[PDB]
Each structure stands twice: as C-alpha cells, then as structure tokens.
C-alpha cells in the first residue's frame, strides 16, 4: 500500500467536480467565468503545499541535505570535520647535567619551527641525553620533512645549541577535511559499532607517531591474565616496533611509558583512556639482542641471485616478532625458494665473536632461543665457501 | 467494526455499479439516486477517521466519493441530456411526440418521465434535446 | 492515537468562517444558506485532507508503520539487510576405479533430492580410487534438510561405482527466504534500547553455526540462590542450543557443542581469541531427555477434523518446548479447548512410559511434570483413549 503525490493535470480536476457538485450542484464551470479563477486558485494552493512538503522532507536526509544543514543533524550525534593536523618527531639534546631545563623549548630544523610537546624534566638527567616528542608549529602537509641535524631556537646555559631528530622523520601532517568527503564517513559510521575486539585495541595503538608493527606477547612470556580476584581475563599487554626510527625498531622506555598512559588512561582500571571501563593493561618495549649469520655456498651462485637470499634474510629478520625463536629453517627455506631444491646450501647463527650475551641460548638443533623483552637483530651477513664444485 | 465497515463499503461500491447500469428518468430522480450514495460514503469515512483508526483507509475512501460525483452527477445531467417544454396546454403523447421530434412513434420515452394519463400529458412536458 | 494534535471541529468551523468575514464580506457572518455557506463548509472539508496527508507522510517515515517496500529502504541505511534463501550443504563419498576421468556436471541424488557438486571437480579420479566432494542442493528452501546416509549416482560415468554413500551426518542448513513482518520485528529489536546487548549479540551468532536451529536462554528452573536466601546472578554467558533437523529430539552430544564453545569465546576463552569481546567467559549448554506419555480423553465426540488438527498443534508445541522448563496439565488443556470451544468436555493426563521412574522427573499434586535443569521433556507417543458417545 502506498499513496504519493498527484500529478497536476488529475489534482485540479479533482478540485473542480468537488466544487462544482458541492457548491453549483453539478453546474459545469464556464470558462472566464468567476468560478474560473476561484477554481484555479484553489488548485495553486493545493499544489504548492506539496512541493514545499516534498522540499523539506528532502534535508531531512543526509545523502542530500545541504552542508550548513549537514553539520547539525551530525554534531548532535557526536559527529564532527577534522582540521588540519600536526606533524610530529622525536628529538635527541645533550649537555651538562644538572642544568635547569624550560618549559618553552623551540627547535628549528630547516625553515620549520618546533615546539616541545611532552614535559620536560626540571633537570638534565644525570647520563645527559634526553629525548623529547615536538610536534610542528604551523599544521598542514608540510611538516613531514625529512631532515636530520636542527638548532635549538634559543641558546640555554649549559646546554648545546646542536639536536638531531631521530631518523630525520616527521609524520602527521595533513590538511582539513571537505564537505563531500566528510557526507560520507558519516553515513557511513552510521552502518558501525564498535565493540572491542583485539584487533581495534592493536588497531588503536598504530595512531601513534612513528609507529609500524604491534605484536602480541610471544611463546616464551608468561602472561599475567587476572590481576585481581577476578573469575574472567582483565589485563592485555603487547609490544611496538618503530623500525624507521630507532635502530632495530626498539625505543627507549621514555617513549613506551607515553603510550601506556595514553591508550590505558592515568589512575588505570578506571577507562581514563581510550581502553574500557575495568581493564589495564601495559606497553613495553625489548632490549636488542645481536646475531651473525653466515651462509655457506652462495659464491657459486650467480651475482644477481647472491643479493635476493641476502636482501630477503635481512628483511625477514629486521620484522621478527621480539621474544621469538629464530629456527634454522626458517631461514634455510628462504634460500630454497629462489636457488632451487637442488642447490648446496647451508646457513648457520653464531654470536658476535661468539661472546655471551643475556638472554640468548643455542639449542642442539641449531636455532636460537630467546627469552622474554629480547629480539633478534642482524649484525652483519657473510659469505663462506669451504667445498668444491664446478 | 471490520466485518461491519468492509461489508457496507463493498455493498455500496456494487450499487453504484449497479446505478451506472440504467437510464435515469430524470434530472431530480437522477441526483436523489446520488445523494444517497455520498451519504453512506461520507457516513463510513466519518468512521474510520473518528480517533485515527485507519488513515490510510479515510484517504482512500475520500478520493473514490468524488470519483463516483463525477460519474454519477454526468448521468443524471447528460445521459439523455432532457429538457423541460412549456406547451400551450396539455395534448396526447402521440401528438407531443411529432411536434417535438418529428417521429410518431417515440411516444413510448414520454411514459416514463412524465405522471398524468396519455391523453392528458403537459402543460409542461420533460423530453430530450433535439441535436439535428 | 493522533500525532498531530487536532482542535475540536467546532473551533476550526469558526476560524474558517472567523476569516472569510474579515477579508471578503468585511465583518458581517454568513447567511444561513448561500454561496459563502458553501465555500465555508468546502474549505473545511479540505482542510481534514490536509491533516490526513499531513499525518499520513509521517507514518509511512516511522519503522514499524512504514510500508514494506519503503521499510527496506531505511533498514539498507543502517546495515540491516534481509536474509535470503539458503541451500542446503554437505559431502558426499565418492568411489571407483582409479584413472577414469570424471565430468562437471554429475550429480546425485537422496530420496527425491537431486544435489551437484559445489566445488571444481578434479580432473580423474586419484590413485586411491576415493574422492570426497561438496554438494548443494538444486533447489532452495527447508526441503533440501535430510536425515540419510546412503544414495545413487543419477548420471552414469564408466569407472564410478553406481553407488554413492554421504559422510557420517547428513545434508542440512537450507531454508526459506525471509518475509516482510518477521523482518520488522528484526529491524526494530536492533533499534530499541535492550540492556546486556552482548548476549544478545552472541545468542544471535550462535545461530549461523551449522546445524543449528534454535537458541534457548537458561529456563526458569536453571535459577540458583546461595545460602543466605538472596538470588545469584551469575557474571558468565550460556544458553542452550538444538539440533531439531540432525539429532533425534533435536538434543545433541557434549563433544558436539565443546566445539562451538571453543569457536565463539576462544581457548583459553577470554582472551578474545575468538567471535567474543576481549574479556567475556561463557560456555555453551546441552540437555538431555526425558520421556512422556500424553492421552487425550474425552475427544470421541468432536468431529474427525476437530480430533486430527487438535492432536497436531499439541504435538507441535511439546516439540518446540525449550529445556528446564515445566510442561503443566493447564498449558495443553488451553490450546485444545481454544479449538473445540470453550464448552466442551476435554481433559488431558501425562504419564511416564511403562509407569516407571526417571531422573530429572517429578510429578506434583496438580499433575504438572517437573523437570530438573538440563532437561528437555521429549514427546516419545500420543494417544487419544477411545470411548462411544452421540450413537
């Protein structure tokens, strides 16, 4: 069952047999006559209240409603555009310690303007290094620049007036948001719930500047699930890497305790954060472990395949999860791949001038073990030859 | 009330039908016929919109009332399209017949519309319009 | 009832004719009878269309007033689509000699129900000489749901043994499309506040899980309270499932549900490994069955259509009873007499079989049949006692 709005041609003769059987008694309505304009007139009033009724029931829906009309009907939902952003950076200063530190720090790079974003300590620390997160002055695309070496804004006793940023990156930056591209992801969130699940806590964590991979705990740590007189799990950790950054994608735990507070709030167990209401949870980083790997046969392959097995192994371990073992196969797999089944070939992992390090191990099958808050990092790849072929 | 409502709104769709399908006598008999049917229809929308029992069925009924005025209000003013005369006193139907028509032997539609014995028909005599 | 306020007609009437003395007839009311009498009484006639079209183009805007064709619209710009026709599904055992090529287009058939293959056929038959397939029914709908476990190739190929046998269960999971009305309760549930939407949440992914057919909350009986006299509420998830189309009374065995319970919270649950939020521990129930005996008396006097149709409704609702629930004298006694007539002379009684004692079953005074948790009452015979009356 439906009923829309008349055309016009079948609504005024409507008019006209109900005016003319109700008021003439079934009189016909000659033309140029008073009734003449007495009916037509009464037809334009029927139809322009269907054509301003059409007219309004139309911004009542987003997909057409006009953008002034947009932005209400959307805030009051908790919908609103986003404005340009800042970039942002790590920075690396040094000096005496023991010096009086500021609150107003500002570093210029290149043409671009820095200022502080975290809290400074009152003090240099006592090793004198210190790491800080700045983000740019002016928001916009153009804060992503990658250089390296920057000057402090303002000389400050005792303290150098040369910084380095961390890998020279910058990322953030972007510009505000239009009309068309914010009609939708709002009709679009409108389809969407939220609910929880690991992957937007794992999701949420890469917003973070700088920020590439999130693993879980690995094999080999013992989690901690209670954390209470609780019958049900109640406590999440998990790790980060920043791999264009920092060397071997591991940071110094100034930056991971940041992120902790952030993401879990600060008292946690109270949902002061972006994480629910009655769970905690942590944000750690591990401490790079060295290792050196020597392949055995590759000199008599041809140049061109030599590089692929060396480039492909840096790679893989350069994203191994931390706290996982490193298996020879894994790596002799690699090779097979590319040089054939049939090929001589041989890997094995030695220690750098085969020291000890804490938190490494050999099993008898040759692999590498690992404990917990440790990762495998390549030191340097070499080439052995000890046979003869061809 | 559904039973009752559905039932008397069928019957009195038929009978309009049922009107359509005959020749009024005339213009007056013709509208009374009429009458009586808007006053049902009007009687049962009345009904069905008292405290917005059934919207949908209150529009629906609305519409088809002025469909049916505009049918029924044609055939009683233009199925035969009659007329009154004004004769100079009262004649035979037989004689009416030739004078207004031409035709003798169309006497037999006069019966119908006008009261008085045959050979007393007038002064004033219903016939239709003469459309040579 | 009405949204938009209307005033009394005898206000509006006056308000027309309040108007039409000021601008045109310049103060003076109507006489009695005369064109402005008309116009007025005209004007107000239009003047309820109005209100109705008015009304009218609000209602066919609101979910569950809206027509069926404009319903679907709104629910398509929420995410909520209708559910469309399913097929039935299962595997099906293949056996012949090894070499013998094998063709796409064969299929099967089980009791009147013709299958295909769902699945790129391999080339010929492997060494072993036996092949496993997936198989869908031609047809849509209920229909395609059996309960066999042995068939025949319909379609002959040299090589293939005339005989065809399915796995172990059975091909199930068909069913009809989905109408108008139940889409619209759907559509509204989801709209309306419900508190603990999370178990709503997972009673309802729990049924796209194959073979299943209903979800049950934990039934009246499943209530427990500590010793201190105050009610417990527990702070896990369960529910109970059946399997109406693939087990006999529809209850199946433990290793069966650890399955899905493992699936929908994860192992260890909790952990968010699983369909469940981060943090949510539940488990997921079977029942086991208790026997019964139903006589119906005093139903020699009704006519034979009477008798046949009341029997099916009770046979129907003892089989979709849920579990640890009691099944009383007075519930089958109601539906029966709602078809006879409030006047007529119908008892029912339940028995055990052989009169003999089971577990988890308990008869009280009024003749109800208690049943403890994890219990489902499983109709196992329905007999109505006979007599002579009306010779």
């Known amino acids: ?390 | 009330n559904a039973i009752f409502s559905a039932v008397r709104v069928l019957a009195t769709a038929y009978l309009s039908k049922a009107y359509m399908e005959t020749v009024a006598s005339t213009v007056n008999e013709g509208l009374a016929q009429y009458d009586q049917i808007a006053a049902i229809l009007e009687q049962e929308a009345q009904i069905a919109q008292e405290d917005c029992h059934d919207n949908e069925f209150f529009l629906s009924i609305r519409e088809f009332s002025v469909s049916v005025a505009r049918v029924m209000v044609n055939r009683a003013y233009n199925s035969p399209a009659l007329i009154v005369y004004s004769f100079p006193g009262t004649m035979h139907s037989l004689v009416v017949a030739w004078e207004i028509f031409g035709d003798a032997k169309r006497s037999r539609e006069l019966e119908g519309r006008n009261t008085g014995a045959p050979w007393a028909i007038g002064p004033k005599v219903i016939a239709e319009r003469v459309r040579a």
């Open chain 1, 1 to 390: 069952c439906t009923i829309q709005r008349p055309e016009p041609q079948a609504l005024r003769d409507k008019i006209a047999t109900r005016f003319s059987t109700n008021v003439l008694g079934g009189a016909e309505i000659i033309p140029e006559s008073n009734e003449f304009y007495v009916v037509t007139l009464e037809y334009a009033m029927q139809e322009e209240f269907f054509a301003f009724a059409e007219q309004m029931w139309r911004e009542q829906d987003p997909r057409y409603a006009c953008c002034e009309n947009l932005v209400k009907m959307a805030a009051r939902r908790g919908v609103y555009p986003k404005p340009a952003q800042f970039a942002q950076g790590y920075v690396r200063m040094t000096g005496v310690p023991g010096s009086a530190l500021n609150q107003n720090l500002r570093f210029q790079f290149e043409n671009q303007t820095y200022e502080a974003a975290s809290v400074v300590p009152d003090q240099l620390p006592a090793t004198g290094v210190l790491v800080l997160r700045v983000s740019a002055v002016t928001p916009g695309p153009s804060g992503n620049i990658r250089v390296t070496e920057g000057s402090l804004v303002t000389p400050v006793p005792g303290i150098s007036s040369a910084v380095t940023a961390y890998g020279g990156n910058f990322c953030g930056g972007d510009d505000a948001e239009e009309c068309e591209p914010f009609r939708t992801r709002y009709l679009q969130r409108l389809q969407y719930e939220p609910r929880l699940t690991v992957e937007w806590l794992k999701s949420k964590a890469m917003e973070w500047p700088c920020v590439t991979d999130v693993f879980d705990l690995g094999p080999n740590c013992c989690s901690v699930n209670a954390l209470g007189e609780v019958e049900c799990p109640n406590n999440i950790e998990f790790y980060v890497l920043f791999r264009d950054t920092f060397d071997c994608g591991l940071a110094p735990q100034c930056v991971v305790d940041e992120i902790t507070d952030w993401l879990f709030g600060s008292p946690q167990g109270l949902g002061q954060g972006e994480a629910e209401f009655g769970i905690c949870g942590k944000v750690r980083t591990a401490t790079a472990v060295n290792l050196d790997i020597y392949l055995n046969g590759l000199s008599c392959a041809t140049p061109a395949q030599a590089r692929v097995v060396e480039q492909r192994i840096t790679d893989f371990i350069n994203r191994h999860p931390p706290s996982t073992n490193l298996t020879v196969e894994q790596l002799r797999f690699i090779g097979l791949q590319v040089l054939g089944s049939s090929f001589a070939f041989d890997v094995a992992i030695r220690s750098p001038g085969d020291a000890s390090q804490s938190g490494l191990r050999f099993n008898a099958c040759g692999d590498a073990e690992i404990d917990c808050d440790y990762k495998a990092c390549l030191n340097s790849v070499q080439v052995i030859n000890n046979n003869v072929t061809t």
